[PDB]
């Protein structure tokens, strides 16, 4: 079985085994010059390959080759079996013009760093099942992968260089996934790095952090799904322009999308908020409009949040108190917008039409106090509401508004529009509650 070898140096082509495991140890694989840097091949016809040490070029983890010379590593596992696993238990770094090709059933890596390199090719096109990667750092990288699980994608930019980027150059199918995408800050004013996909049917991303002067172009991926978080990499102070492009984009259940003037979003197909939340950032008294090229779906449920005693909002506007008054802030524009309640499988059927149900899930906050609708379960909620809309006697004498307890009170004067073409908000000022004022609704009550 196992052929174990501490270290394989080349000096200024092919090591083929046939064994159920080729294990390379801590010495790793060292490639050389233009005499024997120009390609190195490590194969196992029959079994697996495990590398427990780094790839070196001219004796350095750094590496580095000329434009007229590439250093190419090739690992081919299970060549004659199609059941080979190639596992690299050491982080790998590839310097400039250093390429890596792996053929296998399964290819597993810790880190792959091409951040200090340039014109690196990761050729996984002969991987027939799955590539799993812990940490992938790209800059000028041709990532020729079909089916992958990448835990962390770190996309760097290329200084003031032009026409260099992270290229997903194979069709990615419908099964791949990236747990975290982190766009790094690029060079100011330019977009000298970022992600381009050749094509695919569906990509799942759990958390996606964008940064200015970098981009993620997934126009050629029919559908992208964000399962958890889509936000700035510096949410306390987002800045500049990050360019995010999609065909269809879906925000999954309880996922949170932060959307501002700093996140230039192109959505050429459809946008679906499937029971998630879009937080719109106000800068300059204004919001960014989420422009949808084709159809939008706002999907919601009837869960009452334990944290609030009301429906979770699909849209949140914090620092709404800063909104310019007397003007329409258009939040979403699509060719056609649908509204759907997913949990209508409860209570009987509502009398409230879908647009109006949706407007209950459209929230405005005054510094993290809800101001569009006051959810009152007790005296302390009266104060908070008093605080939200700036009514001093609600704060000072809450037992004066005892009539609000058990009730959702609508602050009209924030006016909301949710029709088949847009969602928008028009702010005039704050109303005040009346004993017999109406604008009130009995709170939901789950278990």
- Domain coordinates in residue numbering, the chain: 1-447
Q: Which two tokens stand for residue 355?
A: 């647009």
DSSP state of 311: B
Cα Rg for the chain, rounded, in angstroms? 28
Interatomic CA distance for residues 203 and 150, integer angstroms: 11
First vs last C-alpha separation in the chain: 61
Interatomic CA distance for residues 194 and 287, integer angstroms: 26
* 418 within 8 A of 337, measured Cβ to Cβ: yes
The number of CA neighbours under 13 Å toward the Cβ of 331 is 29
* 127 within 8 A of 145, measured Cβ to Cβ: yes
Burial letters for 150-177: b for 16+ Cβ neighbours within 10 Å, e otherwise? Answer: bebbbbbbbeeeeebbbbbbbbbeeebb
Q: Which two tokens stand for residue 341?
A: 């309640």
Residues with Cβ within 8 Å of 373's Cβ and at least 6 positions away in sequence, in order, are 310, 360, 363, 408, 409, 410, 411
Indicate the SS3 state at residue 176. Answer: coil
Q: Which of 31, 25, 34 has the alpha carbon at shortest distance from 74?
A: 31
* 224 within 8 A of 203, measured Cβ to Cβ: yes
The number of CA neighbours under 13 Å toward the Cβ of 62 is 5
Q: Which of 54, 176, 161, 202 has the alpha carbon at shortest distance from 124?
A: 176
Beta bridge partner(s), residue 295: 336
Residues with Cβ within 8 Å of 156's Cβ and at least 6 positions away in sequence, in order, are 115, 137, 138, 139, 184, 193
Q: Which of 237, 231, 192 has the alpha carbon at shortest distance from 213?
A: 192
Structural method = X-ray
Residues with Cβ within 8 Å of 306's Cβ and at least 6 positions away in sequence, in order, are none
Interatomic CA distance for residues 97 and 154, integer angstroms: 19
Residues with Cβ within 8 Å of 262's Cβ and at least 6 positions away in sequence, in order, are 212, 232, 238, 239, 240, 241, 242, 281
Q: Hey, how many other C-beta atoms are within 10 angstroms of the C-beta on 251?
A: 24
* 89 within 8 A of 121, measured Cβ to Cβ: no
* 158 within 8 A of 191, measured Cβ to Cβ: no
> Concatenated DSSP letters for 276-308?
-EEEEEPBTTB---EEBSSEEEEEE--PBPTTT
Query: What region does 328 belong to: left with phi over 0, alpha with psi -120 to 50, or beta?
Result: beta
* 304 within 8 A of 446, measured Cβ to Cβ: yes
Q: What does the angle CA 180 – CA 183 – CA 188 come to, to the nearest 5 degrees?
A: 170
CB burial of residue 87 (10 Å; 0-12, 13-18, 19+): buried
* 226 within 8 A of 253, measured Cβ to Cβ: no
Tell me the pairing of strands 407-410 and 373-376: antiparallel
């Amino acid at each position: 079985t196992v052929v174990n070898i501490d270290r394989i140096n080349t000096k200024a082509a092919s090591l083929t085994t046939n064994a159920a495991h080729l294990n390379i140890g801590k010495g790793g694989v060292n490639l050389s010059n233009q005499a024997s840097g120009r390609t190195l091949l490590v194969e196992n016809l029959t079994g697996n390959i495990t590398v427990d040490g780094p790839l070196r070029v001219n004796n350095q983890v750094g590496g580095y080759a000329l434009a007229g010379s590439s250093a190419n590593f090739e690992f081919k596992a299970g060549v004659d079996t199609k059941n080979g696993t190639a596992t690299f238990n050491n982080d790998i770094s590839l310097g400039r013009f250093v390429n890596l090709k792996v053929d296998a059933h399964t290819a597993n890596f810790k880190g792959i760093d091409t951040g200090n390199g340039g014109f690196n090719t990761l050729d996984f096109s002969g991987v027939t099942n799955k590539v799993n990667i812990n940490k992938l750092i790209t800059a000028s990288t041709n990532v020729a992968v079909k089916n992958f699980n990448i835990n962390e994608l770190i996309v760097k930019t290329n200084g003031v260089s032009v026409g260099e980027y992270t290229h997903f150059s194979e069709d990615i199918g419908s099964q791949s996934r990236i747990n975290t995408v982190r766009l790094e800050t690029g060079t100011r004013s330019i977009f000298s790095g970022g992600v381009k996909f050749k094509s695919g049917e569906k990509l799942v991303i759990d958390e996606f952090y964008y940064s200015p002067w970098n981009y993620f172009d997934a126009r050629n991926i029919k559908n992208v799904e964000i399962t958890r978080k889509f936000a700035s990499s510096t949410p306390e102070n987002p800045w500049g322009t990050s360019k995010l492009m999609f065909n269809n984009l879906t925000l999954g259940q309880n996922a949170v999308m932060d959307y501002s003037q700093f996140s230039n979003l192109t959505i050429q197909g459809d946008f679906i908020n499937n029971q998630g939340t879009i937080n719109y950032l106000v800068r300059g008294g204004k919001v960014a409009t989420l422009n949808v090229g084709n159809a939008a779906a706002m999907m919601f449920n009837n869960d009452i949040d334990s944290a609030t005693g009301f429906y979770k909002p699909l849209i949140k506007i914090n620092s709404a108190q800063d909104l310019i008054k007397n003007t329409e802030h258009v939040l979403l524009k699509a060719k056609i917008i649908g509204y759907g309640n997913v949990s209508t499988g409860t209570n009987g059927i509502s009398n409230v039409n879908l647009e109006e149900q949706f407007k209950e899930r459209l929230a405005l906050y005054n510094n993290n106090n809800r101001m569009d609708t006051c959810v009152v379960r007790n005296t302390d909620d009266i104060k908070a509401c008093g605080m939200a809309i700036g009514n001093q006697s609600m704060v000072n004498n809450p037992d004066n508004y005892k009539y609000l307890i058990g009730k959702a009170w609508k602050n009209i004067g924030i006016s909301k529009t949710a029709n088949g073409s847009k969602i928008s908000v028009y702010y005039l000022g704050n109303s005040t509650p009346t004993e017999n004022g109406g604008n009130t609704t009995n709170l939901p009550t789950n278990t």
